[PDB]
Amino acid sequence: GEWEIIDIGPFTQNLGKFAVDEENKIGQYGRLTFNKVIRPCMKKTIYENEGFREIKGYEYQLYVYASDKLFRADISEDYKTRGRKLLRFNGPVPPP
Amino acid sequence: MGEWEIIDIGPFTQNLGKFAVDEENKIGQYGRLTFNKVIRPCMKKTIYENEGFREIKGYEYQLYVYASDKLFRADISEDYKTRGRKLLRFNGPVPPP
Ligand code: NA
């Protein structure tokens, strides 16, 4: 797929909240509090294995502050189902 | 202060991956790695001087680096004036972009 840098407006902040809420169901870090998503935010547009530029879905790479610690979260979104999944959540990591 | 962009993966970028692996070989966390190549996407931050109007103080790069058949994430700083570089972080294996 292609990658681009995207804004950290409300839509991006809500991806961060999604990531923290999903990580809180897992419980690996205990109960995290969402603060904010920071730059840079990277979005991948994913195409079907067949055709040219048939959009399957999206992936996001976020830097998210939760409980005052910086994490990396990877999120997938399927175009047809509108379903979001937390793929990975790791850290704490140093600031970019 | 600064701006992020996606950059090409030409010889400037590949030499950043080489630098990253040579620096990581000095640290030794992964033993002795053999640099393969940098893959897209490569991210570059241009950092501005704290002295008026937009003047470049340096760069930060975040790269995906294949070394010894394994993918790592590397963070590199480059000072604008001296062209000196610092490996800030080298971690993996990481999932493919
Ligand atoms: Na957004």
Short mmCIF file of C-alpha atoms and ligand atoms in Angstrom, two decimals:
data_model
loop_
_atom_site.label_atom_id
_atom_site.label_comp_id
_atom_site.label_asym_id
_atom_site.label_seq_id
_atom_site.Cartn_x
_atom_site.Cartn_y
_atom_site.Cartn_z
CA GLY A 1 0.00 0.00 0.00
CA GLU A 2 1.03 3.71 -0.02
CA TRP A 3 1.95 5.63 3.18
CA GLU A 4 1.29 9.29 3.90
CA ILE A 5 1.65 11.58 6.90
CA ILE A 6 -1.74 12.74 8.24
CA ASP A 7 -2.97 15.45 10.61
CA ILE A 8 -3.52 14.99 14.38
CA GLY A 9 -7.01 16.47 14.37
CA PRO A 10 -10.02 14.96 16.08
CA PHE A 11 -10.23 11.90 13.82
CA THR A 12 -6.60 10.98 14.72
CA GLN A 13 -7.16 11.69 18.42
CA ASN A 14 -10.13 9.26 18.24
CA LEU A 15 -7.87 6.58 16.73
CA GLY A 16 -5.67 7.08 19.84
CA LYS A 17 -8.66 6.75 22.16
CA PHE A 18 -9.69 3.58 20.28
CA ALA A 19 -6.16 2.18 20.77
CA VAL A 20 -6.09 2.91 24.54
CA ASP A 21 -9.66 1.57 25.03
CA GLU A 22 -8.76 -1.67 23.16
CA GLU A 23 -5.45 -2.01 25.09
CA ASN A 24 -7.44 -1.60 28.33
CA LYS A 25 -9.59 -4.65 27.41
CA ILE A 26 -6.31 -6.63 26.94
CA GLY A 27 -5.00 -5.24 30.27
CA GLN A 28 -1.24 -5.70 29.51
CA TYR A 29 -0.31 -2.27 30.98
CA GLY A 30 -3.15 -2.19 33.51
CA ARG A 31 -5.72 0.61 33.07
CA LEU A 32 -4.22 3.33 30.85
CA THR A 33 -5.65 6.87 30.55
CA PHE A 34 -5.68 8.37 27.03
CA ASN A 35 -3.96 11.82 26.80
CA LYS A 36 -3.24 12.67 23.20
CA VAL A 37 -1.86 11.49 19.86
CA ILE A 38 1.24 13.46 18.72
CA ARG A 39 2.93 13.98 15.33
CA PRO A 40 3.99 12.13 13.32
CA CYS A 41 0.92 10.05 12.36
CA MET A 42 1.33 7.67 9.37
CA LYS A 43 -1.54 6.17 7.34
CA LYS A 44 -1.26 3.29 4.89
CA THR A 45 -3.91 2.75 2.16
CA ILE A 46 -4.12 -1.02 1.39
CA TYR A 47 -5.30 -2.38 -2.00
CA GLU A 48 -6.86 -5.79 -2.80
CA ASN A 49 -4.48 -8.53 -4.10
CA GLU A 50 -6.53 -8.31 -7.38
CA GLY A 51 -7.32 -5.34 -9.71
CA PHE A 52 -5.56 -1.93 -9.61
CA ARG A 53 -6.22 0.36 -6.58
CA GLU A 54 -9.23 -1.65 -5.18
CA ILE A 55 -9.21 -0.28 -1.52
CA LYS A 56 -9.24 -3.09 1.03
CA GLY A 57 -8.51 -0.94 4.10
CA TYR A 58 -6.17 1.27 6.05
CA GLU A 59 -3.46 0.97 8.70
CA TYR A 60 -2.35 3.71 11.07
CA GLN A 61 0.88 4.10 13.05
CA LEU A 62 0.35 6.37 16.06
CA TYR A 63 2.43 7.84 18.84
CA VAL A 64 -0.04 8.00 21.73
CA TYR A 65 0.49 9.40 25.24
CA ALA A 66 -1.46 7.35 27.82
CA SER A 67 -0.94 7.71 31.64
CA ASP A 68 1.86 10.22 30.75
CA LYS A 69 3.91 7.54 28.87
CA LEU A 70 4.44 7.44 25.09
CA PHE A 71 3.33 4.29 23.21
CA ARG A 72 3.32 3.13 19.57
CA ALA A 73 -0.05 1.78 18.41
CA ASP A 74 -0.81 0.14 15.08
CA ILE A 75 -4.51 0.11 14.04
CA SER A 76 -6.21 -1.52 11.03
CA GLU A 77 -9.52 -0.38 9.50
CA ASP A 78 -11.36 -2.55 6.93
CA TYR A 79 -13.05 -0.49 4.20
CA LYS A 80 -16.14 -2.68 3.71
CA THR A 81 -16.80 -3.72 7.38
CA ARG A 82 -15.82 -0.28 8.83
CA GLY A 83 -14.24 -2.45 11.60
CA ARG A 84 -11.20 -1.19 13.54
CA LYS A 85 -8.69 -3.49 15.23
CA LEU A 86 -5.72 -2.75 17.45
CA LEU A 87 -2.89 -4.78 15.89
CA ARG A 88 -0.06 -3.83 18.26
CA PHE A 89 0.56 -1.51 21.25
CA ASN A 90 4.11 -1.20 22.60
CA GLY A 91 6.24 1.00 24.80
CA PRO A 92 6.91 3.09 26.53
CA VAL A 93 9.00 4.53 23.63
CA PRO A 94 11.12 7.69 23.33
CA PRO A 95 9.53 10.80 21.78
CA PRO A 96 9.95 11.16 17.98
CA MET B 1 9.98 22.97 15.87
CA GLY B 2 9.88 21.25 12.46
CA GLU B 3 7.94 19.35 9.78
CA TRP B 4 7.62 15.62 8.85
CA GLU B 5 7.57 14.21 5.31
CA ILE B 6 7.93 10.81 3.54
CA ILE B 7 11.23 10.76 1.53
CA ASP B 8 12.55 8.56 -1.32
CA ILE B 9 14.76 5.51 -0.64
CA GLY B 10 17.76 6.53 -2.91
CA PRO B 11 21.50 6.41 -1.94
CA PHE B 12 21.16 9.18 0.72
CA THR B 13 18.51 7.05 2.49
CA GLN B 14 20.40 3.72 1.92
CA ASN B 15 23.55 5.31 3.47
CA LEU B 16 21.42 6.25 6.47
CA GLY B 17 20.52 2.50 6.83
CA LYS B 18 24.24 1.57 6.46
CA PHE B 19 25.11 4.21 9.18
CA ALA B 20 22.37 2.74 11.41
CA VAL B 21 23.70 -0.83 11.08
CA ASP B 22 27.38 0.25 11.50
CA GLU B 23 26.43 2.21 14.66
CA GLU B 24 24.34 -0.71 15.97
CA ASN B 25 27.30 -3.07 15.37
CA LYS B 26 29.33 -0.84 17.78
CA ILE B 27 26.55 -1.17 20.45
CA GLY B 28 26.25 -4.98 19.87
CA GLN B 29 22.61 -5.50 21.02
CA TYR B 30 21.97 -7.76 17.98
CA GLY B 31 25.53 -9.08 17.50
CA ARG B 32 27.19 -8.37 14.14
CA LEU B 33 24.51 -7.41 11.60
CA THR B 34 24.94 -7.19 7.79
CA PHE B 35 23.10 -4.18 6.25
CA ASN B 36 20.77 -5.21 3.39
CA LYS B 37 18.63 -2.18 2.45
CA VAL B 38 16.20 0.51 3.63
CA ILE B 39 12.59 0.03 2.51
CA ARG B 40 9.72 2.57 2.12
CA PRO B 41 8.37 4.35 4.06
CA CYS B 42 11.17 6.55 5.24
CA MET B 43 10.20 9.57 7.36
CA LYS B 44 12.24 12.74 7.70
CA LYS B 45 11.71 15.61 10.16
CA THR B 46 13.29 18.96 9.37
CA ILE B 47 14.10 20.68 12.72
CA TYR B 48 14.17 24.50 12.79
CA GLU B 49 16.68 26.74 14.64
CA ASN B 50 15.30 28.67 17.72
CA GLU B 51 16.62 31.85 15.96
CA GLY B 52 13.86 33.80 14.08
CA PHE B 53 12.58 32.76 10.56
CA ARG B 54 12.90 29.14 9.24
CA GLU B 55 16.59 28.04 9.26
CA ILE B 56 17.41 24.29 9.39
CA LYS B 57 19.13 23.10 12.64
CA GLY B 58 19.12 19.39 11.62
CA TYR B 59 17.02 16.34 10.62
CA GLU B 60 15.57 13.24 12.22
CA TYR B 61 14.95 10.13 10.13
CA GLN B 62 12.84 7.09 11.04
CA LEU B 63 13.73 4.13 8.81
CA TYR B 64 12.87 0.51 8.32
CA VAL B 65 16.13 -1.41 7.89
CA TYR B 66 16.72 -4.96 6.75
CA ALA B 67 19.92 -6.35 8.31
CA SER B 68 20.92 -10.02 8.51
CA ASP B 69 17.49 -10.90 6.91
CA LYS B 70 15.58 -9.20 9.81
CA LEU B 71 13.60 -5.90 9.77
CA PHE B 72 14.48 -3.21 12.42
CA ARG B 73 13.25 0.34 13.07
CA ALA B 74 16.05 2.94 13.33
CA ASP B 75 15.89 6.59 14.43
CA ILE B 76 18.83 8.81 13.27
CA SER B 77 19.59 12.48 13.97
CA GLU B 78 21.71 14.59 11.60
CA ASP B 79 23.12 18.05 12.59
CA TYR B 80 22.68 20.52 9.63
CA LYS B 81 25.95 22.43 10.15
CA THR B 82 28.41 19.55 10.91
CA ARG B 83 26.54 16.73 9.04
CA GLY B 84 27.25 14.63 12.18
CA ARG B 85 24.79 11.78 12.83
CA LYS B 86 23.61 9.93 15.94
CA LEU B 87 21.85 6.58 16.05
CA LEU B 88 19.06 7.37 18.58
CA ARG B 89 17.20 4.00 18.54
CA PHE B 90 17.56 0.62 16.74
CA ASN B 91 14.87 -1.93 17.67
CA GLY B 92 13.45 -5.14 16.25
CA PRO B 93 12.51 -7.37 14.77
CA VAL B 94 9.46 -5.27 13.79
CA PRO B 95 6.52 -6.19 11.54
CA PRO B 96 6.76 -5.13 7.87
CA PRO B 97 5.07 -1.82 6.93
NA NA C 1 -7.09 13.15 11.19
#
